[PDB]
Amino acid sequence: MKRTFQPSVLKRNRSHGFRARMATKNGRQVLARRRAKGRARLTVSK
Amino acid sequence: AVVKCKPTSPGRRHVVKVVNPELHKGKPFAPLLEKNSKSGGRNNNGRITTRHIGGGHKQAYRIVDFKRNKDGIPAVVERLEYDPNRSANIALVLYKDGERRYILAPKGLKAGDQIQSGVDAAIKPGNTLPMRNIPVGSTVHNVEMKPGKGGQLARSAGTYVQIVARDGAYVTLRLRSGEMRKVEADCRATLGEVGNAEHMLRVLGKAGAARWRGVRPTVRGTAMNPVDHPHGGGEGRNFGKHPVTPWGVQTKGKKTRSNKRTDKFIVRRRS
Amino acid sequence: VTSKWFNIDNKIVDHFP
RNA sequence: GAGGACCGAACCGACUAAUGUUGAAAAAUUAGCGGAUGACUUGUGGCUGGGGGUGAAAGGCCAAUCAAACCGGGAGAUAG
RNA sequence: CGCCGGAAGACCAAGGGUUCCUGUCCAACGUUAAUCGGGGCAGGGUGAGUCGACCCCUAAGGCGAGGCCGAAAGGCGUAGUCGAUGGGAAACAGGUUAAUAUUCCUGUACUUGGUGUUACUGCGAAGGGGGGACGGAGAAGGCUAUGUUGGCCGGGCGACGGUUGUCCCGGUUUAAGCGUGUAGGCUGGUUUUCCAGGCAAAUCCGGAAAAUCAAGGCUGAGGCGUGAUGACGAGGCACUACGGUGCUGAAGCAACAAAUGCCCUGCUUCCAGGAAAAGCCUCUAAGCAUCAGGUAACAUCAAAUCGUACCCCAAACCGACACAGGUGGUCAGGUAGAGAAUACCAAGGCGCUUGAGAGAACUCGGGUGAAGGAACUAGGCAAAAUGGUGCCGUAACUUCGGGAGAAGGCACGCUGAUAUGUAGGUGAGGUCCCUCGCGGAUGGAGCUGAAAUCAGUCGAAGAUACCAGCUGGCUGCAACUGUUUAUUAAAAACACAGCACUGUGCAAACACGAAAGUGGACGUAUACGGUGUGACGCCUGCCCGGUGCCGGAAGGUUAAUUG
RNA sequence: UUCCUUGUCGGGUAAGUUCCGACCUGCACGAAUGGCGUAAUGAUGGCCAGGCUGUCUCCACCCGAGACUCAGUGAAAUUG
RNA sequence: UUUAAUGUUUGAUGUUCUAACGUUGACCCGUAAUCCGGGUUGCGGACAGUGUCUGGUGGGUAGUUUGACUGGGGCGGUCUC
Ligand SMILES: N[C@@H](Cc1c[nH]c2ccccc12)C(=O)O
Ligand SMILES: [K+]
Ligand SMILES: [K+]
Ligand SMILES: [K+]
Ligand SMILES: [K+]
Ligand SMILES: [K+]
Ligand SMILES: [K+]
Ligand SMILES: [K+]
Ligand SMILES: [K+]
Ligand SMILES: [K+]
Ligand SMILES: [K+]
Ligand SMILES: [K+]
Ligand SMILES: [K+]
Ligand SMILES: [K+]
Ligand SMILES: [K+]
Ligand SMILES: [K+]
Ligand SMILES: [K+]
Ligand SMILES: [K+]
Ligand SMILES: [K+]
Ligand SMILES: [K+]
Ligand SMILES: [K+]
Ligand SMILES: [K+]
Ligand SMILES: [K+]
Ligand SMILES: [K+]
Ligand SMILES: [K+]
Ligand SMILES: [K+]
Ligand SMILES: [K+]
Ligand SMILES: [K+]
Ligand SMILES: [K+]
Ligand SMILES: [K+]
Ligand SMILES: [K+]
Ligand SMILES: [K+]
Ligand SMILES: [K+]
Ligand SMILES: [K+]
Ligand SMILES: [Mg+2]
Ligand SMILES: [Mg+2]
Ligand SMILES: [Mg+2]
Ligand SMILES: [Mg+2]
Ligand SMILES: [Mg+2]
Ligand SMILES: [Mg+2]
Ligand SMILES: [Mg+2]
Ligand SMILES: [Mg+2]
Ligand SMILES: [Mg+2]
Ligand SMILES: [Mg+2]
Ligand SMILES: [Mg+2]
Ligand SMILES: [Mg+2]
Ligand SMILES: [Mg+2]
Ligand SMILES: [Mg+2]
Ligand SMILES: [Mg+2]
Ligand SMILES: [Mg+2]
Ligand SMILES: [Mg+2]
Ligand SMILES: [Mg+2]
Ligand SMILES: [Mg+2]
Ligand SMILES: [Mg+2]
Ligand SMILES: [Mg+2]
Ligand SMILES: [Mg+2]
Ligand SMILES: [Mg+2]
Ligand SMILES: [Mg+2]
Ligand SMILES: [Mg+2]
Ligand SMILES: [Mg+2]
Ligand SMILES: [Mg+2]
Ligand SMILES: [Mg+2]
Ligand SMILES: [Mg+2]
Ligand SMILES: [Mg+2]
Ligand SMILES: [Mg+2]
Ligand SMILES: [Mg+2]
Ligand SMILES: [Mg+2]
Ligand SMILES: [Mg+2]
Ligand SMILES: [Mg+2]
Ligand SMILES: [Mg+2]
Ligand SMILES: [Mg+2]
Ligand SMILES: [Mg+2]
Ligand SMILES: [Mg+2]
Ligand SMILES: [Mg+2]
Ligand SMILES: [Mg+2]
Ligand SMILES: [Mg+2]
Ligand SMILES: [Mg+2]
Ligand SMILES: [Mg+2]
Ligand SMILES: [Mg+2]
Ligand SMILES: [Mg+2]
Ligand SMILES: [Mg+2]
Ligand SMILES: [Mg+2]
Ligand SMILES: [Mg+2]
Ligand SMILES: [Mg+2]
Ligand SMILES: [Mg+2]
Ligand SMILES: [Mg+2]
Ligand SMILES: [Mg+2]
Ligand SMILES: [Mg+2]
Ligand SMILES: [Mg+2]
Ligand SMILES: [Mg+2]
Ligand SMILES: [Mg+2]
Ligand SMILES: [Mg+2]
Ligand SMILES: [Mg+2]
Ligand SMILES: [Mg+2]
Ligand SMILES: [Mg+2]
Ligand SMILES: [Mg+2]
Ligand SMILES: [Mg+2]
Ligand SMILES: [Mg+2]
Ligand SMILES: [Mg+2]
Ligand SMILES: [Mg+2]
Ligand SMILES: [Mg+2]
Ligand SMILES: [Mg+2]
Ligand SMILES: [Mg+2]
Ligand SMILES: [Mg+2]
Ligand SMILES: [Mg+2]
Ligand SMILES: [Mg+2]
Ligand SMILES: [Mg+2]
Ligand SMILES: [Mg+2]
Ligand SMILES: [Mg+2]
Ligand SMILES: [Mg+2]
Ligand SMILES: [Mg+2]
Ligand SMILES: [Mg+2]
């Protein structure tokens, strides 16, 4: 039956995209933590 | 005219509807319409701040004139119309210069009647005058509280205000609730009563009819758990406590008016 | 993983009240 | 030609029985069953955030987790 | 040979991202083998002025210069600026690749801008007005898609009795555009004068008055003509790597039936009273005035960029799987049928990635059963049974609607006649009239076609299969339709229309917010919030001592403060 | 809602702790945390009858898919 | 002890006033703007409202407590001399 993940690229970018993290102070700290860890993919983008 | 429906269904058995055949069967006047989208009872924080509001039929707003400050120019009544935003009916009037406006339709007013606002108008239903020019004892509606602000009191169907006394710069009104209020005599009022006086004689008949007006169901506090409502809880049907609101404030008797800057205008509270 | 359903089921598990 | 009208497919649901129970499936299948122009159902987007939301009210639901979500930290909490 | 065929066929959106096509390989992957594959390796494949995005315009909502507010971080919000799931210019038929096509080729079209020439001319907006622009249900009329039959054309004369005929098989297709303006729908038209309105102006909109005309205008499916001396075309002939390729090519009409599609954003009706903004049309202001600009014709130039393969009810998406699950839209053939149910079929697509034997108990899914018929069991659980249309007939009770399909019963196939096919529907020719055409009257050929009666006839059975109510009597609870414990509870629980109490005079009570503010409500006591009860009928008795709430002010007690 | 209790009486059955009607001794009903009725409605609770039947007396046979044998692939819980 | 008078006032109540303060009244401007600010005016007016201090109320919310013995716990009884 219907599971929990129903993909949609528009709602994926508007919620966890780059421009959405960079909008608030707390979202720019998520990016600072992921650069400090050294992740190959900062956000879930294209 | 109230008409009882026939019990061809269990949802039609108790319906009583108020049907007025003089209403305009057609579209409203377009230049006086606005968009009016619904809230759900939610404020700019997103939260429900008033409960039991939601859904309903789509409605458009009719820009009604509550000020009536087009003095000196006579106006003829064109038609009576339906307004989904209020309990009373509205009348479309046409001034001599070619301007059209909506007003609250008073009792007994038909299509073709002549109305006129201003300080020198005649004492007949539909005319708006400052309350220093209205005889003591008259029945008015659409009363102002501040001069030039617009009518605020006695707006809904069948309601009216009585002018009890005039002493100085103030007039004493008998509000529809039974309250005696002082209002300054420069404020305007309209002669007569508000029409559609049998709006209160209707019976919705079924639970879906209340949902067409954007009224969602009320759950009784005694039917919840203690975490939800002060009345919640019980093994069976218990109550055992003084009735209160969902936020613990005593209902059924406890007064809630605390406004010290308007107490001087109130002669006698309602009883 | 989730446990075996018969270990969850109140009738089977709580047999000696 | 009205109706929260009637019988009944799509569509929405979930009353009974049998099977399955290291399943074909972490809730289904088969045979029956209820609503089916409405308080209906559905696509796309949006808003409400944790002692908070939302709730036709079952402590129900809030990503297979809910009488207080999840992640990280205080943290090697404390454990007669 | 079997299965699906309102899909298990075809086309997409979302999502995925090379799974597409060709060659080659079989270690691993595939629940077995594999020469095969959505597997490995290499190469190829996605072509647009018109399709979609981008673009212009906005909804819910987001962000938000100044601003208001807040220990800081920040919150709200004006001017603005974004934001589709909505509004806004334009293309069709045929052919072609292993793989793309409304994109390539052939034929025939259309749209919006820039520039230039000629002719004429009051152009101009961040402003005014119009338009865009809108609900549910219902009914009917006119049509088409489509189908069937006849005619026409090509072929056939049948493995076993018959088959030159009232016989058998196949085909009978053609678009956008351009021209005409029909069934239907709406509306009176024109001219002159004036005006407290449309933030100023206006010749535009609104209002007033007068004169005059019996018509005008707008909208509109389909048909017809052209597009088309073309294209396609059953077949036939000629080659071949036997896959395919090349050439030629007949008829290509009529009647009837007919949509859930179109006219129709229509019409009628009801109450619950049904987006916004731009493109578009028009008016003028500041302004410019032999300028610029506007209108029409002609010529010329431009229309960029990104997507385009393939799967999409699924082995490619969400479910850890090549997983009996989930997933929005579009298309909708035949016979029977009311039907998108159901049975059998067409186009098309498949036989579900372990098989071969045997014919024990026992389990699962089914078929039938002597005599009995609930004796079974907690309980008729489960099974069995009823089941259609038409007609006759139908009780208590009732809120007069119901109960009710109550219960119960009868007819039902086929053939012939009434009637070489009836009632009904459609309607050619011919004739007449004018308004001379997509017109009206008459007329009836042809086509289509129930239902009934009478007579006969076959079987055990004629609603023959699939499909398709079990019925009745007494009683508890809840009035009723609804809602609920996703995943052991659907209920007597929740809700409900109705009733009552109570708060609230508007900067309302109340709720969310350190606040600003927002909802209540662009509402105003016939309104709004909270509480309890729960349709309707007859009703709702006594107690204010306790706790709570409402009112009172004399007296007693009583905080900071003063000292 | 009634402990005593399967109260007592009547109906229905050959036989009825359930059901229906009545009595009143209401352990411990009662008027809007409503009382008593009530047509229609309910995948609601209890009881009775007709029809129908493998539910049963009491099982028998048959048609398929497994179980069994052969070839290929090849698990799991548990375990001093 | 007890009062009246004058001068002055303190505290109380009342009455007017406007100039602080309020305005979710009207109009004008910034301005293409239902925010905001400024100006004019009207209506309230030393009230309301806010800060500090203070009495009351306050399961709306929070942190916690709710003994042991015991022929099992609870109930009952007991706990020192
Ligand atoms: N036994 C059932 C239902 C079930 C699922 N999860 C459960 C948990 C508890 C009891 C039963 C269940 C099953 O295995 O499908
Ligand atoms: K407009
Ligand atoms: K309720
Ligand atoms: K309870
Ligand atoms: K109807
Ligand atoms: K219908
Ligand atoms: K919707
Ligand atoms: K929490
Ligand atoms: K999670
Ligand atoms: K291999
Ligand atoms: K497999
Ligand atoms: K769109
Ligand atoms: K314009
Ligand atoms: K005009
Ligand atoms: K393509
Ligand atoms: K065997
Ligand atoms: K039936
Ligand atoms: K239910
Ligand atoms: K419930
Ligand atoms: K009230
Ligand atoms: K509002
Ligand atoms: K008392
Ligand atoms: K009392
Ligand atoms: K009392
Ligand atoms: K009792
Ligand atoms: K007896
Ligand atoms: K007896
Ligand atoms: K009742
Ligand atoms: K039920
Ligand atoms: K019943
Ligand atoms: K002032
Ligand atoms: K004060
Ligand atoms: K002991
Ligand atoms: K013992
Ligand atoms: Mg409410
Ligand atoms: Mg209510
Ligand atoms: Mg509960
Ligand atoms: Mg509580
Ligand atoms: Mg109780
Ligand atoms: Mg219905
Ligand atoms: Mg559900
Ligand atoms: Mg089920
Ligand atoms: Mg089913
Ligand atoms: Mg049904
Ligand atoms: Mg139905
Ligand atoms: Mg159904
Ligand atoms: Mg509805
Ligand atoms: Mg969950
Ligand atoms: Mg906690
Ligand atoms: Mg530890
Ligand atoms: Mg520590
Ligand atoms: Mg690959
Ligand atoms: Mg392939
Ligand atoms: Mg293999
Ligand atoms: Mg493949
Ligand atoms: Mg491959
Ligand atoms: Mg590969
Ligand atoms: Mg903002
Ligand atoms: Mg700081
Ligand atoms: Mg925009
Ligand atoms: Mg292809
Ligand atoms: Mg406009
Ligand atoms: Mg056609
Ligand atoms: Mg020939
Ligand atoms: Mg021949
Ligand atoms: Mg022969
Ligand atoms: Mg033929
Ligand atoms: Mg705009
Ligand atoms: Mg997938
Ligand atoms: Mg999958
Ligand atoms: Mg995984
Ligand atoms: Mg498979
Ligand atoms: Mg699958
Ligand atoms: Mg579906
Ligand atoms: Mg079918
Ligand atoms: Mg086929
Ligand atoms: Mg043998
Ligand atoms: Mg067998
Ligand atoms: Mg038998
Ligand atoms: Mg027999
Ligand atoms: Mg028995
Ligand atoms: Mg027995
Ligand atoms: Mg049964
Ligand atoms: Mg009877
Ligand atoms: Mg009757
Ligand atoms: Mg009847
Ligand atoms: Mg009958
Ligand atoms: Mg009983
Ligand atoms: Mg009910
Ligand atoms: Mg559960
Ligand atoms: Mg459940
Ligand atoms: Mg259930
Ligand atoms: Mg209320
Ligand atoms: Mg109740
Ligand atoms: Mg009482
Ligand atoms: Mg008191
Ligand atoms: Mg007895
Ligand atoms: Mg029994
Ligand atoms: Mg009894
Ligand atoms: Mg009681
Ligand atoms: Mg009681
Ligand atoms: Mg009571
Ligand atoms: Mg009763
Ligand atoms: Mg129901
Ligand atoms: Mg083996
Ligand atoms: Mg192992
Ligand atoms: Mg172990
Ligand atoms: Mg004062
Ligand atoms: Mg506590
Ligand atoms: Mg602690
Ligand atoms: Mg102890
Ligand atoms: Mg003890």
Tab-separated table of N, CA and C (backbone and C1' of nucleotides) in Angstrom, chain B residues 34-35 44 51 59 61-62 82 86 97 149 152 157 176-177 179 181 220 222 229 252-253 256-257 269-270, chain E residues 60 196 206 273-274 494-495 501-507 509 518 522-527 530-533:
chain	number	residue	atom	x	y	z
B	34	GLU	N	-15.655	42.440	-4.436
B	34	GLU	CA	-14.258	42.226	-4.103
B	34	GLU	C	-14.040	40.747	-3.838
B	35	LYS	N	-12.776	40.352	-3.806
B	35	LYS	CA	-12.413	39.001	-3.409
B	35	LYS	C	-12.443	38.892	-1.890
B	44	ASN	N	-2.185	35.049	11.525
B	44	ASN	CA	-0.953	35.111	10.746
B	44	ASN	C	0.161	34.243	11.325
B	51	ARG	N	-12.303	28.413	17.065
B	51	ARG	CA	-12.630	27.047	16.700
B	51	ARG	C	-13.963	27.000	15.961
B	59	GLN	N	-17.725	32.832	-1.408
B	59	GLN	CA	-18.490	34.066	-1.320
B	59	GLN	C	-17.679	35.222	-1.874
B	61	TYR	N	-17.449	39.587	-1.721
B	61	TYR	CA	-17.760	40.671	-0.808
B	61	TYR	C	-18.463	41.786	-1.567
B	62	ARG	N	-19.539	42.296	-0.983
B	62	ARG	CA	-20.280	43.431	-1.517
B	62	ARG	C	-19.917	44.661	-0.706
B	82	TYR	N	-29.503	39.626	-2.690
B	82	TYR	CA	-29.032	38.698	-1.683
B	82	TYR	C	-27.580	39.025	-1.349
B	86	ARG	N	-23.892	38.734	5.232
B	86	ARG	CA	-24.639	39.258	6.374
B	86	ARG	C	-26.032	38.644	6.376
B	97	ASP	N	-26.795	61.772	-10.058
B	97	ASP	CA	-25.631	62.039	-10.887
B	97	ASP	C	-25.148	60.812	-11.649
B	149	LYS	N	-17.380	57.940	11.164
B	149	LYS	CA	-16.730	56.636	11.158
B	149	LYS	C	-17.529	55.595	10.387
B	152	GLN	N	-22.262	51.242	12.948
B	152	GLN	CA	-21.777	50.041	13.625
B	152	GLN	C	-22.848	49.291	14.404
B	157	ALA	N	-30.323	41.508	10.723
B	157	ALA	CA	-31.706	41.493	10.253
B	157	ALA	C	-32.698	41.675	11.397
B	176	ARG	N	-30.261	47.103	21.258
B	176	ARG	CA	-31.048	45.892	21.070
B	176	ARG	C	-30.853	44.882	22.203
B	177	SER	N	-29.709	44.912	22.889
B	177	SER	CA	-29.470	44.019	24.020
B	177	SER	C	-30.190	44.456	25.290
B	179	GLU	N	-29.212	47.517	26.686
B	179	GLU	CA	-28.234	48.395	27.305
B	179	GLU	C	-28.525	49.840	26.939
B	181	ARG	N	-26.920	53.331	26.260
B	181	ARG	CA	-25.621	53.855	25.869
B	181	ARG	C	-25.731	55.315	25.467
B	220	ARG	N	-17.957	18.133	22.766
B	220	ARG	CA	-18.170	18.513	24.153
B	220	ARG	C	-16.920	18.224	24.975
B	222	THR	N	-16.681	17.334	28.037
B	222	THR	CA	-16.877	16.168	28.887
B	222	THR	C	-16.653	14.862	28.134
B	229	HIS	N	-9.148	18.711	27.942
B	229	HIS	CA	-10.134	19.627	28.457
B	229	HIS	C	-10.239	19.455	29.965
B	252	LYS	N	-20.612	30.086	32.506
B	252	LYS	CA	-21.911	30.067	33.196
B	252	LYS	C	-21.952	31.022	34.398
B	253	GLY	N	-21.805	32.317	34.116
B	253	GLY	CA	-22.036	33.332	35.130
B	253	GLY	C	-20.982	34.413	35.278
B	256	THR	N	-16.852	39.121	32.109
B	256	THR	CA	-15.563	39.229	31.443
B	256	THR	C	-15.286	40.615	30.885
B	257	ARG	N	-16.180	41.581	31.068
B	257	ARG	CA	-15.908	42.938	30.614
B	257	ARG	C	-14.963	43.641	31.581
B	269	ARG	N	-26.257	48.724	32.357
B	269	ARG	CA	-25.924	47.463	31.720
B	269	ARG	C	-27.187	46.654	31.448
B	270	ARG	N	-27.080	45.741	30.488
B	270	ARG	CA	-28.195	44.864	30.168
B	270	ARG	C	-28.496	43.953	31.357
E	60	A	P	-4.438	35.492	-2.312
E	60	A	O5'	-4.134	34.147	-1.523
E	60	A	C5'	-5.188	33.389	-0.949
E	60	A	C4'	-4.767	31.973	-0.664
E	60	A	C3'	-3.557	31.819	0.243
E	60	A	O3'	-3.851	31.961	1.623
E	60	A	C1'	-3.306	30.412	-1.641
E	196	A	P	-22.282	69.173	-13.581
E	196	A	O5'	-22.279	68.041	-12.459
E	196	A	C5'	-23.278	68.008	-11.442
E	196	A	C4'	-22.670	67.811	-10.074
E	196	A	C3'	-22.353	66.363	-9.691
E	196	A	O3'	-21.104	66.313	-9.004
E	196	A	C1'	-23.720	67.344	-8.042
E	206	G	P	-22.922	52.566	-20.041
E	206	G	O5'	-23.185	53.406	-18.719
E	206	G	C5'	-23.256	52.770	-17.448
E	206	G	C4'	-23.542	53.766	-16.352
E	206	G	C3'	-24.820	54.568	-16.504
E	206	G	O3'	-25.981	53.853	-16.122
E	206	G	C1'	-23.057	56.026	-15.936
E	273	G	P	-24.027	31.490	0.482
E	273	G	O5'	-24.015	31.987	-1.032
E	273	G	C5'	-22.980	31.624	-1.939
E	273	G	C4'	-23.251	32.133	-3.334
E	273	G	C3'	-23.099	33.641	-3.475
E	273	G	O3'	-22.550	33.907	-4.765
E	273	G	C1'	-25.308	32.995	-4.066
E	274	G	P	-21.492	35.086	-4.987
E	274	G	O5'	-20.245	34.367	-5.665
E	274	G	C5'	-19.425	33.464	-4.942
E	274	G	C4'	-19.176	32.210	-5.733
E	274	G	C3'	-18.896	32.423	-7.215
E	274	G	O3'	-17.525	32.661	-7.464
E	274	G	C1'	-20.608	30.824	-6.965
E	494	C	P	-20.823	10.113	23.089
E	494	C	O5'	-19.948	10.684	21.900
E	494	C	C5'	-18.653	11.226	22.119
E	494	C	C4'	-18.084	11.748	20.831
E	494	C	C3'	-18.949	12.761	20.102
E	494	C	O3'	-18.805	14.081	20.590
E	494	C	C1'	-18.329	11.070	18.599
E	495	A	P	-20.053	15.071	20.571
E	495	A	O5'	-20.316	15.339	19.029
E	495	A	C5'	-19.331	15.931	18.194
E	495	A	C4'	-19.793	15.949	16.770
E	495	A	C3'	-21.149	16.586	16.518
E	495	A	O3'	-21.064	17.990	16.333
E	495	A	C1'	-21.101	14.451	15.533
E	501	C	P	-32.743	30.199	28.832
E	501	C	O5'	-31.376	30.094	29.634
E	501	C	C5'	-31.346	29.608	30.965
E	501	C	C4'	-29.938	29.321	31.414
E	501	C	C3'	-28.972	30.485	31.363
E	501	C	O3'	-29.105	31.367	32.468
E	501	C	C1'	-27.964	28.587	30.378
E	502	U	P	-28.945	32.952	32.262
E	502	U	O5'	-27.407	33.129	31.927
E	502	U	C5'	-26.415	32.897	32.907
E	502	U	C4'	-25.050	32.785	32.290
E	502	U	C3'	-24.555	34.001	31.534
E	502	U	O3'	-24.101	35.032	32.397
E	502	U	C1'	-24.106	32.051	30.269
E	503	G	P	-24.285	36.582	32.018
E	503	G	O5'	-22.929	36.913	31.271
E	503	G	C5'	-21.672	36.554	31.825
E	503	G	C4'	-20.602	36.518	30.766
E	503	G	C3'	-20.528	37.734	29.857
E	503	G	O3'	-19.858	38.829	30.471
E	503	G	C1'	-20.354	35.755	28.562
E	504	U	P	-20.338	40.331	30.206
E	504	U	O5'	-20.010	40.566	28.674
E	504	U	C5'	-18.677	40.602	28.198
E	504	U	C4'	-18.640	40.693	26.699
E	504	U	C3'	-19.424	41.830	26.072
E	504	U	O3'	-18.740	43.068	26.171
E	504	U	C1'	-19.799	39.834	24.857
E	505	G	P	-19.515	44.403	26.571
E	505	G	O5'	-20.065	44.961	25.194
E	505	G	C5'	-19.179	45.320	24.145
E	505	G	C4'	-19.591	46.616	23.506
E	505	G	C3'	-19.855	47.793	24.450
E	505	G	O3'	-19.417	49.002	23.829
E	505	G	C1'	-21.764	47.380	23.138
E	506	C	P	-17.923	49.539	24.054
E	506	C	O5'	-17.099	48.952	22.827
E	506	C	C5'	-17.380	49.332	21.484
E	506	C	C4'	-16.466	48.618	20.527
E	506	C	C3'	-16.562	49.056	19.071
E	506	C	O3'	-15.279	48.959	18.450
E	506	C	C1'	-17.085	46.770	19.228
E	507	A	P	-14.512	50.281	17.977
E	507	A	O5'	-12.985	49.914	18.183
E	507	A	C5'	-12.349	48.915	17.393
E	507	A	C4'	-11.389	48.112	18.224
E	507	A	C3'	-11.992	47.516	19.494
E	507	A	O3'	-11.417	46.241	19.760
E	507	A	C1'	-10.238	48.997	20.071
E	509	A	P	-12.277	42.537	24.639
E	509	A	O5'	-12.817	41.223	25.337
E	509	A	C5'	-13.733	41.287	26.421
E	509	A	C4'	-14.656	40.099	26.434
E	509	A	C3'	-13.968	38.748	26.360
E	509	A	O3'	-13.477	38.300	27.614
E	509	A	C1'	-15.728	38.803	24.796
E	518	U	P	-3.290	43.915	12.167
E	518	U	O5'	-3.576	42.351	12.238
E	518	U	C5'	-3.086	41.466	11.245
E	518	U	C4'	-3.260	40.024	11.644
E	518	U	C3'	-4.693	39.553	11.801
E	518	U	O3'	-5.332	39.268	10.567
E	518	U	C1'	-3.415	38.780	13.620
E	522	C	P	-14.463	38.396	6.983
E	522	C	O5'	-14.483	39.716	6.092
E	522	C	C5'	-15.603	40.586	6.082
E	522	C	C4'	-15.324	41.881	6.798
E	522	C	C3'	-16.344	42.986	6.573
E	522	C	O3'	-17.477	42.842	7.417
E	522	C	C1'	-14.149	43.852	6.312
E	523	G	P	-18.778	43.764	7.246
E	523	G	O5'	-19.893	43.016	8.095
E	523	G	C5'	-20.250	41.661	7.836
E	523	G	C4'	-20.369	40.844	9.094
E	523	G	C3'	-21.169	41.476	10.219
E	523	G	O3'	-22.569	41.300	10.064
E	523	G	C1'	-19.119	40.641	11.067
E	524	U	P	-23.591	42.449	10.519
E	524	U	O5'	-23.213	42.758	12.023
E	524	U	C5'	-23.562	41.854	13.061
E	524	U	C4'	-23.564	42.513	14.418
E	524	U	C3'	-24.521	43.696	14.572
E	524	U	O3'	-25.101	43.671	15.876
E	524	U	C1'	-22.298	44.362	15.092
E	525	A	P	-26.541	44.339	16.137
E	525	A	O5'	-27.232	43.309	17.121
E	525	A	C5'	-27.593	41.998	16.693
E	525	A	C4'	-27.796	41.060	17.854
E	525	A	C3'	-28.845	41.518	18.863
E	525	A	O3'	-29.542	40.377	19.356
E	525	A	C1'	-26.786	41.198	19.965
E	526	U	P	-30.958	39.963	18.735
E	526	U	O5'	-30.599	39.192	17.399
E	526	U	C5'	-30.206	37.828	17.414
E	526	U	C4'	-30.480	37.160	16.093
E	526	U	C3'	-29.761	37.757	14.888
E	526	U	O3'	-29.532	36.716	13.944
E	526	U	C1'	-32.075	37.869	14.535
E	527	A	P	-28.189	35.850	13.989
E	527	A	O5'	-27.062	36.951	14.194
E	527	A	C5'	-26.210	37.364	13.140
E	527	A	C4'	-24.899	37.861	13.683
E	527	A	C3'	-24.027	36.808	14.354
E	527	A	O3'	-23.285	36.033	13.422
E	527	A	C1'	-24.193	38.698	15.752
E	530	G	P	-15.807	28.391	21.055
E	530	G	O5'	-16.311	28.344	22.557
E	530	G	C5'	-15.387	28.397	23.638
E	530	G	C4'	-16.075	28.335	24.974
E	530	G	C3'	-16.835	27.068	25.275
E	530	G	O3'	-16.015	25.964	25.585
E	530	G	C1'	-18.115	28.907	25.955
E	531	U	P	-16.552	24.488	25.284
E	531	U	O5'	-17.695	24.261	26.356
E	531	U	C5'	-17.404	24.194	27.742
E	531	U	C4'	-18.658	24.143	28.568
E	531	U	C3'	-19.610	22.996	28.292
E	531	U	O3'	-19.178	21.769	28.826
E	531	U	C1'	-20.847	24.975	28.461
E	532	G	P	-19.308	20.449	27.954
E	532	G	O5'	-20.814	20.012	28.181
E	532	G	C5'	-21.250	19.487	29.431
E	532	G	C4'	-22.718	19.721	29.653
E	532	G	C3'	-23.654	18.832	28.857
E	532	G	O3'	-23.778	17.525	29.401
E	532	G	C1'	-24.424	21.066	28.780
E	533	U	P	-24.015	16.259	28.447
E	533	U	O5'	-25.484	16.474	27.894
E	533	U	C5'	-26.626	16.197	28.684
E	533	U	C4'	-27.888	16.657	28.001
E	533	U	C3'	-28.265	15.945	26.712
E	533	U	O3'	-28.908	14.698	26.945
E	533	U	C1'	-28.449	18.270	26.389
